[PDB]
Design a protein around this nucleic acid. Structure first.
Lengths: 54, 191, 122, 31, 32, 54
RNA sequence: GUAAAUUUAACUGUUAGUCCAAAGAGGAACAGCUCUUUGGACACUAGGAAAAAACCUUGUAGAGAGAGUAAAAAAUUUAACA
C-alpha cells in the first residue's frame, strides 16, 4: 500500500528538482497531431449489453 | 466585588535549587509581556539574573504589604535553574520588557504602586511598577515618538543598510534591537 | 563575528518621494555611473579593498565611469559607503570622433563635448 | 582606565554629511 | 554589570540618531 | 594641460565604448527574443490533422 | 568588473602577537586575565583625538613662500496655590 501511493506521488509534477526533469525526455507539450483514419463508431450500450450477457 | 481571590492569595515559596549564557539577559523579552489575570505588575526594564535571595526578599515584602482579601499576587518568574559556578548558586535570567511579578485584585494602581515600586528598586536590574493603563500608555507613547520623530536618520535605517559601514562597529544582534538595547541595559528614550 | 553584509533589496527600491528629491526618472534609467572614491579603504575589510581595486577607484576623488548594470551594481553596493555615485549626463549627446579631444566632465556630472574656456555671451 | 569621550556638534554634522551622500548612492543604484 | 564603554563610532551613531521632537510654529498654550 | 587632454580623451573614449557595448547588448537580446517568437510559429502545423477531426 | 592564476626549474628568510570591534567558551557577566573564531590596526607615511603602537582621517614616495578638503571643539542645574 505504501509503494502504491509512493509510485503515484513520484509521477506527479513537483516544484523541486526531480529525477524526471534531468533524465525524463523533453518533448513538445502540445498534443501529437493525429493524421490517421477516424476511429470507428461503436454503440457502448449495445456493446456493454452483449459483453455482460456473454 | 466581582474579582475573586484565590484560596492562596500571598505569594508562594520559591525553591532555593531546582528539584531536577550571557545572551539570556540580552535583548527584548519574548515571553510574559502581557498581563494575565492581573491589572498591575512589575515591569523589568533591564536584564539581570535573579538568585533565590531576591525571591525571598520580594515574597516577604509583597506578602506583608498586601492585604490577602483585597488583592492576590501570582509569580511569573520560574524557579532558579541556571547554574553559576564560582554549583555556587542558582539564578533566573530576566530579559528586558518582562513582567517579574503581577498584582491583581480589588485595588488601585496608586495603592499597589507603593509596595511594588519599593520591591522594584531592590531588584538587581531597573524595574518599574506598571498597570494595564500605564503599560499601554507606555507602549502607545513609544509608538507615537517613532511616527512623529523629526530626525530623518534612525539607527535601524543606518544599521540595516550598513551606511558608513556602521556594521563594523555594531553587533549582529543590533539589527533586531535597532539601538534600543545595549547589552543587558535597555534605553527607553531610544527610538 | 564580523562578516560580509547583505543589504535587503528594499533599501534599493526608490520611492516616489526619492525621485522628486534627486531628479531621477525610473522610466528612463541612466546608462552610465560616475563613481568617485571619497573614503579610505584603510580599516575596512579586505573584500572591500579588492572591490575598490577592481572598479579602478584606488585613487580618491578620481571620476570613473561604469555601466549601470546589475553585475556592476552588485560590486558598487559592497563599497557604497566609500564612494559617490552620480549619473553621467550627456546634454550634447555622446562625443563624436571630432569631439574626443574637446570634452570635459563638469562637477554637475555632465560631459560636455565642447570646452572653449571662453565666457558665454551676455 | 579609559576617560570618556564626547561627540561634538561638528562631529555630528560630519556624520550627517556622509549619510546624505550614501542615501543618494542608494537611489542611483535603484534603477 | 557596569555600562560598558561604546566604540566612539557607535556613540557618534547614537547621537546622530537621537529623537528630535516636533516643534509647533505657534505654542499650543498661546492659542485659544 | 597635455596630460589633462590625454586623460579626458581616454575618459571620453571609455564613455563611448561602454555606451555602445550596452546598446549593442540591448539590441542583441531583443533579436533573440524576436527569434524565439518566430521559432514558435515555425512548427505550427507541419501535417494537417486527419484523425477524428473533420 | 577586472588581471591575475596555475605549473616547472631553483632558492632564502620570517613566523614565541599586542590592542580595538564582534560572536562564543572559562574566570568573578575582575584584570592591559584564559582559549577559539571573524574583521581591523600596529614592524611603510602623515593629519586628528592633551601627551598618545592598537581609536578616527589618510595611505606613503620629489620641489613650490598656490588651492580644495578629511578626521577634527561635550553637555547638563533638578515646581506650587491655599
Amino acid at each position: 500500500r505504501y509503494r502504491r501511493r509512493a509510485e503515484q506521488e513520484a509521477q506527479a509534477p513537483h516544484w523541486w528538482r526531480t529525477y524526471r526533469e534531468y533524465f525524463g525526455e523533453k518533448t513538445d507539450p502540445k498534443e501529437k497531431i493525429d493524421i490517421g483514419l477516424p476511429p470507428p463508431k461503436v454503440s457502448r450500450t449495445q456493446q456493454l449489453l452483449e459483453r455482460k450477457q456473454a | 466585588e466581582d474579582v475573586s481571590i484565590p484560596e492562596k492569595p500571598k505569594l508562594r515559596f520559591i525553591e532555593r535549587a531546582p528539584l531536577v549564557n550571557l545572551s539570556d539577559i540580552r535583548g527584548p523579552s519574548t515571553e510574559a509581556t502581557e498581563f494575565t489575570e492581573g491589572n498591575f505588575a512589575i515591569l523589568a526594564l533591564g536584564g539581570g539574573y535573579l538568585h533565590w535571595g531576591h525571591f525571598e526578599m520580594m515574597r516577604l515584602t509583597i506578602n506583608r504589604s498586601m492585604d490577602p482579601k483585597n488583592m492576590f499576587a501570582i509569580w511569573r518568574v520560574p524557579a532558579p535553574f541556571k547554574p553559576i559556578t564560582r554549583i555556587d548558586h542558582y539564578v533566573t535570567p530576566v530579559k528586558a520588557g518582562r513582567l517579574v511579578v503581577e498584582m491583581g485584585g480589588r485595588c488601585e494602581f496608586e495603592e499597589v504602586q507603593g509596595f511594588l515600586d519599593q520591591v522594584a528598586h531592590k531588584l538587581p536590574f531597573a524595574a518599574k511598577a506598571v498597570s494595564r493603563g500605564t503599560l499601554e500608555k507606555m507602549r502607545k507613547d513609544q509608538e507615537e515618538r517613532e511616527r512623529n520623530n523629526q530626525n530623518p536618520w534612525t539607527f535601524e535605517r543606518i544599521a540595516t543598510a550598513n551606511m558608513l559601514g556602521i556594521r563594523k562597529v555594531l553587533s549582529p544582534y543590533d539589527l533586531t534591537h535597532k539601538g534600543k538595547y545595549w547589552g543587558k541595559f535597555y534605553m527607553p528614550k531610544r527610538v | 563575528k564580523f562578516t560580509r553584509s547583505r543589504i535587503p533589496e528594499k533599501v534599493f527600491q526608490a520611492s516616489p518621494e526619492d525621485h522628486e528629491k534627486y531628479g531621477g526618472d525610473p522610466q528612463n534609467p541612466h546608462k552610465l555611473h560616475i563613481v568617485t572614491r571619497i573614503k579610505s579603504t584603510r580599516r575596512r575589510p579586505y573584500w572591500e579593498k579588492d572591490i575598490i581595486k577592481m572598479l579602478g577607484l584606488e585613487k580618491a576623488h578620481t571620476p570613473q565611469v561604469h555601466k549601470n548594470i546589475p553585475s556592476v551594481n552588485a560590486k558598487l553596493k559592497v563599497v557604497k559607503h566609500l564612494i559617490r555615485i552620480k549619473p553621467l549626463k550627456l546634454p550634447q549627446g555622446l562625443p563624436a570622433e571630432e569631439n574626443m579631444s574637446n570634452t570635459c566632465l563638469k562637477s554637475t556630472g555632465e560631459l560636455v563635448v565642447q570646452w572653449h574656456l571662453k565666457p558665454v555671451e551676455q | 582606565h579609559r576617560r570618556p569621550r564626547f561627540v561634538s556638534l561638528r562631529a555630528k554634522q560630519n556624520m550627517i554629511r556622509r549619510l546624505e551622500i550614501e542615501a543618494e548612492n542608494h537611489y542611483w543604484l535603484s534603477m | 554589570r557596569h555600562r560598558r564603554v561604546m566604540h566612539f563610532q557607535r556613540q557618534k551613531l547614537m547621537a546622530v540618531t537621537e529623537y528630535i521632537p516636533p516643534k509647533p510654529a505657534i505654542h499650543p498654550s498661546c492659542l485659544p | 594641460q597635455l596630460r589633462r587632454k590625454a586623460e579626458r580623451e581616454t575618459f571620453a573614449r571609455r564613455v563611448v565604448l561602454l555606451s555602445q557595448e550596452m546598446d549593442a547588448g540591448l539590441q542583441a537580446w531583443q533579436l533573440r527574443q524576436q527569434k524565439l517568437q518566430e521559432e514558435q510559429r515555425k512548427q505550427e502545423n507541419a501535417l494537417k490533422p486527419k484523425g477524428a477531426s473533420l
